[PDB]
Amino acid sequence: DVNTFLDVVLSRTQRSRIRGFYGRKVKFTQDTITEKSLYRCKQLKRAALGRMATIIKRQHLSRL
């Protein structure tokens, strides 16, 4: 499912400089999903995840 794929993408992603890394990690998570201050950086990364989650929410060949 789409939610399962997003969870798999999140699992795949899990498997100054820190602020840039957090944005890169969010971008890397978004790239994998698309292909298929620390608190401020985490909030920006969470916002990217939230935007991806909204996009994520938005048989015949086998039986032939």
Resolution of the PDB structure in angstroms: 3.0
Q: What's the token pair of residue 32?
A: 């994998």
Determined by cryo-EM
Q: For residues 1 and 20, give the distance between their C-alpha atoms in angstroms, rounded to a whole number.
A: 31
Q: What's the token pair of residue 16?
A: 């100054």
Please write down the HEC assignment for all residues of 2-54: HHHHHHHHHHHHHCCHHHHHHHHHHHHHHHHHHHCCHHHHHHHHHHHHHHHHH
8 A C-beta contact, residue 52 and residue 30: yes
Q: Map tokens 């939230």 to a residue.
A: 50
Q: Identify residue 23 by its one-letter amino acid code.
A: G
Q: Identify residue 4 by its one-letter amino acid code.
A: T
Q: For residues 26 and 47, give the distance between their C-alpha atoms in angstroms, rounded to a whole number.
A: 9
Q: Map tokens 């795949």 to a residue.
A: 12
Q: Which residues contact 31 (CB under 8 A, 6 or more apart)?
A: none
